[model samples]
Target: PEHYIKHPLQNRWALWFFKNDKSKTWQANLRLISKFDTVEDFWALYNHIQLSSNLMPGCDYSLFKDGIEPMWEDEKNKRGGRWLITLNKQQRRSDLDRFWLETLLCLIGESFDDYSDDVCGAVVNVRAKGDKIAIWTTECENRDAVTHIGRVYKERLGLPPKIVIGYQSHADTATKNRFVV
Candidate 1:
């Protein structure tokens, strides 16, 4: 049908692009691409944007809640942590896109039920050394919520049971991981 109603997502989301440029400020290098709160619009934006595979190393793609900037210093993210899924160079082709797509869907779909409120956003870093995709959430010490979100997140990623993922908070970035699921 030519006439179609858009399906709205629970929260508005902003997509940010970061390409490391030696001469520019970090904030200058990170630019807001677009914001969308509807399913169809998200697809359109996603399709139009270049895939992470084509991104140069040291670049990143961040999708965060409308009001929140992707940086750790954001007030909403100051106390938060992330459920990180790291990938080797080979898996960038084999797993990156699928994992990134699923992560977005999970955020838009509110896959964590009650814990979705704690969900902040997600990021995919394309780097020469390795790649990383992570779901950032506020309230790093909400044990049940944190673990539950991680549990559901890993399930959505469909990683093999033996392949574990870990959660690291802003406060514990260097300390041991809080949990591994």
Candidate 2:
């Protein structure tokens, strides 16, 4: 057979879509859209779906390692924190899709190197106030690892030097700025 070979990713990832419905429970509105483990498959899924910027306000798109639910309460995320990137309304048209695609590429490509394992997943939230993107890590207390991931992710997104992002643990979602990079 002369078929092209699909390259395998370091880990299988699940893509989830969230539709916020006031009548439905949070868990009920979330659905596992698909799982992929190869670069080819990832492209197929990515190209077929709505871009993060196109999702309705209150909706979200999450890509996580297989078997790990996207919720903060999931075991892989319970003790973790997130490196958050807040996008203003204007950036959504200019940056939301690109940032999200880059984030997905980074995850599937394992671009974080040694710190990759510390990453639980990444999420994009579409909102009327502002959109947001975040990379969730397995250990919030591992300052060395967390900061390393934050720096790398920020650089990957090609954000300006002055545009900082913050890391907040699931345990302290109400508090602002547990860590900043």
Candidate 3:
């Protein structure tokens, strides 16, 4: 008998790191760390990196599909939005790391069914005030797809059903009060 490894995903993914330096612009601080396409590779990369809870304030980790820039300006993400989960300062010590790891697993596992194609990536922002984890998807008005994705995501993260995770369109989240469903 042969030991078989799991098959690779259809698309490759890129990991990015953002460390805000008072001296450098936001874009300048964001840089591509690496790319991987296999489950093993994803774990290897993840293991070599620091956990989100350990990151210094003003730092972020973004894992995006290959060719997507993980920024609002990116062609793949320009019209998309993110389902934002804000963690209070206390959650950082308890839930932040686990939630982020689960999010990465969800993204790399294509847990969104047919709508997975619309998923750009997942991001974890480590802030002095509070931390945040969000899934960036490629469309906003596709209510069915977006809503389904959000529900699945929230469920997968094992969040309480009563906790409402807001899905905010990039245009709205970046602008005025965002669309939430």
Candidate 4:
């Protein structure tokens, strides 16, 4: 007898949206759009949505695990950190969307192997100052996991070897004058 098989990821993820509105609290600004556990569903949704570069300024697109909120207050993310990749104003026209899509694919596809367990989610912030992309992880003190994820993510983004991305704990990012790469 022969058997067919299908593999499912270790976890499911939820996509989120954040539109700035003065009338709403920061948490209210964030809302879940949907969740998908299959590759086809993920691609279908990706194809249907506008790219991060096209989102209006002050808007955000976030993809986090099913149980975790995209905010710092979420238990899964409260002690977490992020690897931030900032794009120049010019890159917005050419690479912003592409990089963001790739980032989404990487997260949903579990492209990081064993390190995937440490990943919390990813966020893309469209701001007037500059657009920002970040990958959030569950623990800030896990240097090995954090650094490995950053290096793998940078490679996945196809960034130039000369370019460097930085990782910052939510605590530090909120209060510090600097960040560590």
Candidate 5:
């Protein structure tokens, strides 16, 4: 017999692609790329896809837990928020892809030990104003879980300790400086 192995991830993931097509409705623009639960399958999909830096400013990548739509309104069945990582255009060249890849690795690797289940998903937006990445989690209500994830996420991405990132709820309007890690 020959030995063969493929690592099975604890939680599954689905990658969604969101193209900013002004001509069409959002429902028409957002689409699922693929879902994978195996280590090899994730790496398989990760490499072939477009890099975050190379994406058109209007596009976004939504990597969410399976069964969740990549819509803020749609996820209303659940409560959540995101620890936002704002990247200037300068970092798009220096760290966009790397940050994205690192984020994905953290996602797939279950880097947030205790609050691993707290993680809902993540999204990266390529925009003219600035690029952004966020790790979406259960809720801002759970400060312990939320804070822990942000700290782990920040360290995992090797973000500078002095720099701070904010966490915003699903229902924010007036840009409140809610929480940071």
Candidate 6:
């Protein structure tokens, strides 16, 4: 029994896939692939999937805590925002996969310490121009929580000091950055 036992994650997480179907409504194009609450199951799912970089330009992969939808409109996400990491064209080939895997590990491993509860989920967008990975948190207005999450996230990704990432609230993606670290 001990040999077969699996390590449990702190929270159950759902993996959602978004395939851009021009003919379908946005909501219709998004779907929940599966939910996993253990380490072995998570690896099985991750191993079976196509890497984010291989997905079509309009596709997206979202991993969120169980019961939380990937959209900003979700109750847990409505007042939230994200720590965005935008990769350049070249970096897409060189860095996208590693950065994304690290991001996923961070979420499932609760790498944010005391601020982990503030995190809602993460998203990886595959695009032609440049790919983007963002970690969504429950409260954009909670300066202490948001800043700590962002700082730890940046460090986990091992980004250079010169490369600044910005946090954007869901209410206004077009507005100025709310926090940067």
- Tell me the lDDT of candidate 3: 0.88
What is the per-residue lDDT of model 3 for residues 1-181, given as tens digits with 9 covering 90 to 100? 2368755977799999999999988899999999999888888899999999999999999999998898888887778899998999999999999999989888888999999998999899999999999999898778888888888988888888677888877877656324454
Q: Give the Cα-based TM-score of candidate 5 against the true structure.
A: 0.93
lDDT of 5 by residue, 95-168 (tens): 99999999998898899998988888889999999999988887678889888999889998988888988998
What Cα-based lDDT does every candidate model obtain? 0.93, 0.92, 0.88, 0.84, 0.86, 0.95
Evaluated against the true structure, the overall lDDT of model 6 is 0.95
- Candidate 1 vs candidate 3: the lDDT winner is 1
Compute the lDDT for candidate 1.
Answer: 0.93
Preferred candidate (TM-score higher): 2 or 4: 2
TM-score of each: 0.95, 0.96, 0.94, 0.91, 0.93, 0.97
Count of clashes, each model? 0, 0, 0, 0, 0, 0
Candidate 6: residue 40 lDDT (0-100): 96
Residue 141 of model 2, lDDT score: 86
- lDDT by residue (1-181, candidate 6, tens digit) is 7888899999999999999999999999999999999999999999999999899999999999999999978999999999999999898899999999999999999999989999999999999989999999999999999999999999999999998899999999834689989
Q: Which predicted model would earn the best lDDT? A: 6
* Pairs in steric clash, model 4: none
Error of 4 at 55 (Å): 1.0
Question: Cα RMSD to native, each candidate?
Answer: 1.9, 1.5, 1.7, 2.6, 1.9, 1.1
Candidate 2 off by > 4 Å: 1-3
